[PDB]
């Protein structure tokens, strides 16, 4: 991480996989929160209507 902090592109420790997985993990957290909000608000009214 310290090497990445200085943008050591010339360094052979190009942890591309770690960055990609971090993007996936961040995307999952946003998706989970967004789905939770939609479930709590958007679909509750439709469930009540169908009932």
């Amino acid at each position: 991480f310290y090497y990445y902090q200085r943008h050591f592109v010339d360094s052979e420790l190009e942890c591309n996989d770690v960055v990609l997985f971090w993007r996936i993990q961040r995307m999952l957290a946003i998706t989970a929160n967004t789905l939770r909000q939609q479930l709590t608000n958007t679909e509750v009214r439709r469930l009540e209507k169908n009932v």
């Binding site: 996936i24 961040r26 946003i30």
Partner: protein, 50 residues
């Protein structure tokens, strides 16, 4: 359950939402880097066990 119908516009809205979220390429948090390492280790270990 049969009468259930999810919002059609949610799919289109979310497509852009996660597209912009994944477009970032900078990790400003040290703990986020460590968390990604741990998350990778768990996923790799499961595949390795199989």
């Amino acid at each position: 359950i049969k009468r259930h119908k999810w919002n059609d516009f949610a799919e289109d809205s979310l497509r852009v939402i996660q597209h912009n979220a994944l477009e970032d390429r900078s990790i400003s948090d040290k703990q986020q880097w460590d968390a990604a390492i741990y998350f990778m280790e768990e996923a790799l270990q499961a595949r390795l066990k199989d």
